[PDB]
Motif scaffolding. Structure first.
Motif, PDB file in Angstrom:
ATOM      1  N   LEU A  87      22.471 144.819  56.578  1.00 45.98           N
ATOM      2  CA  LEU A  87      21.545 143.622  57.025  1.00 45.98           C
ATOM      3  C   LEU A  87      21.171 144.223  58.405  1.00 45.98           C
ATOM      4  CD1 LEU A  87      21.123 140.861  56.172  1.00 45.98           C
ATOM      5  CD2 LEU A  87      23.245 140.103  57.131  1.00 45.98           C
ATOM      6  N   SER A 100      16.494 145.344  55.914  1.00 43.67           N
ATOM      7  CA  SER A 100      17.911 145.531  55.174  1.00 43.67           C
ATOM      8  C   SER A 100      17.511 146.749  54.086  1.00 43.67           C
ATOM      9  CB  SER A 100      18.390 144.435  54.519  1.00 43.67           C
ATOM     10  OG  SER A 100      17.409 143.596  53.327  1.00 43.67           O
ATOM     11  N   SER A 137      13.273 142.095  57.474  1.00 40.63           N
ATOM     12  CA  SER A 137      14.183 141.054  57.520  1.00 40.63           C
ATOM     13  C   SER A 137      13.554 139.738  58.028  1.00 40.63           C
ATOM     14  CB  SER A 137      15.476 141.420  58.111  1.00 40.63           C
ATOM     15  OG  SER A 137      16.137 142.423  57.669  1.00 40.63           O
TER      16      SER A 137
END
Ligand SMILES: C/C(=C\CNc1ncnc2c1ncn2[C@@H]1O[C@H](CO)[C@@H](O)[C@H]1O)CO
Length: 377
Positions: free
Chosen positions: A8, A13, A37
């Motif tokens: 993450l 990601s 992201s």
């Protein structure tokens, strides 16, 4: 059931699965192994990944990104104050904590950072589910080595919201060390140099008979490949104004098209010495056609490249290490593919070659998937 591995990241990601003794880093629906992201809340639709990032140009206040910079922090923290001044979507003070406010069908809607990170995790989870053809309820998720308990817990809470039990949080330097297969026997000191799209992190990781410990961390939270692209953008915006009496900053769509070609040119310049940046009708009736050399790419960014050594000096000083004590250098993040970055690191270490991989943006997820495998036995 299965345990997947998810990086993450601040800007992107990446998800891997461990199956039949293989780690597979999985493609999203657009065929890419890393996913921006980004989450957009425009016109009553919610998008996640590249489709959301594309909304940022015309809907900057509705397009949420960089939530990793807020997660588990306080509204009055000096980092969050700076981030609020940089970020275009509204950030509000919810009982001391930053929350994100956007509109959904014109209604004000306020999300915790972990609720936006959950949407990213859910998309990574869905990629794993389609690939494995079964539900996924468990994951290993990575965090920065400098994350505190609140930041780790908020990341775990993002997992719970996404229907993932985060069976283990491991730090990004440990995940890279697993991916590169660094020998766990005896004692090794490793400099993990992680230069991504938005952030720079350096860690001294010590591996001792299979026990991983990050002795020291330092970095620059606003230094990455996006900054190198912006230096190039700034230069060609000046040039196009000189030649054409057009300031491309007056047209948001023109800037978006330029940024995409500049990022491609930058990647080409890791391989070749000269590349063409071409956009037909960057505005109506005016083509963009420029050559960029590696030498000019390096000149435009040399100060930022050299800045990366300041955190390297700080971690060696925090750990009370000499350069000699580092046994190996592991590069993480796509920006470590820039020849000049590698040369600057090699030279700082009075000639020692940095270890590096081939897909440095996938190494963290790859190591998270290995960790998932280690936990299943
Ligand atoms: C073909 C090859 C090198 C060419 N590739 C790259 N050169 C320079 N920067 C890169 C590259 N790949 C990813 N990034 C950046 O990494 C950040 C994280 O995604 C973003 O800013 C990307 O722009 C030699 O193998």
């Amino acid at each position: 059931g299965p345990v997947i591995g998810i990086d993450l990241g601040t800007t992107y990601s990446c998800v891997g699965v461990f199956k039949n003794g293989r780690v597979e880093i999985l493609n999203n629906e657009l065929g890419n192994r890393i996913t921006p992201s980004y989450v957009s809340f425009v016109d009553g639709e919610r998008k996640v990944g590249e489709a959301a990032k594309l909304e940022a140009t015309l809907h900057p206040t509705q397009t949420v990104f960089d939530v990793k910079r807020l997660i588990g922090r306080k509204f009055d923290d000096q980092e969050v104050v700076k981030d609020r001044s940089l970020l275009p979507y509204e950030i509000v003070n919810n009982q001391g904590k930053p929350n994100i406010k956007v509109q959904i069908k014109d209604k004000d809607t306020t999300f915790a950072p972990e609720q936006i990170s959950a949407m990213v995790l859910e998309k990574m989870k869905e990629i794993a589910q389609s690939f494995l053809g079964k539900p996924v309820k468990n994951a290993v998720v990575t965090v920065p080595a400098y994350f505190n308990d609140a930041q780790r817990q908020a990341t775990k809470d993002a997992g719970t919201i996404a229907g993932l039990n985060i069976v283990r949080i491991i730090n990004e330097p440990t995940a890279a060390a697993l991916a590169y297969g660094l020998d766990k026997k005896e004692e090794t000191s490793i400099l993990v140099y992680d230069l991504g799209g938005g952030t720079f992190d350096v860690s001294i990781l010590v591996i001792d008979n299979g026990v991983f410990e990050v002795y020291a961390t330092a970095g620059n939270t606003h230094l990455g490949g996006e900054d190198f692209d912006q230096r190039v953008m700034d230069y060609f915006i000046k040039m196009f104004k000189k030649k054409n009496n057009i300031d491309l900053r007056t047209d948001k769509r023109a800037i978006q098209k330029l940024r995409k070609e500049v990022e491609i040119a930058k990647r080409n310049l890791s391989v070749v010495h000269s590349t063409q940046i071409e956009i037909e009708d960057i505005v109506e009736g005016h083509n963009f056609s420029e050559t960029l050399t590696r030498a000019k790419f390096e000149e435009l960014n040399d100060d930022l490249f050299r800045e990366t050594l300041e955190p390297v000096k700080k971690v060696l000083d925090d750990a009370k290490y000499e350069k000699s004590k580092i046994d190996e250098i592991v590069l993480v993040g796509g920006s470590t593919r820039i020849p000049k970055i590698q040369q600057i690191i090699k030279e700082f270490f009075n000639g020692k070659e940095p270890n590096r991989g081939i897909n440095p943006d996938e190494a963290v997820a790859y190591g998270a998937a290995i960790q998932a495998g280690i936990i299943l036995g």
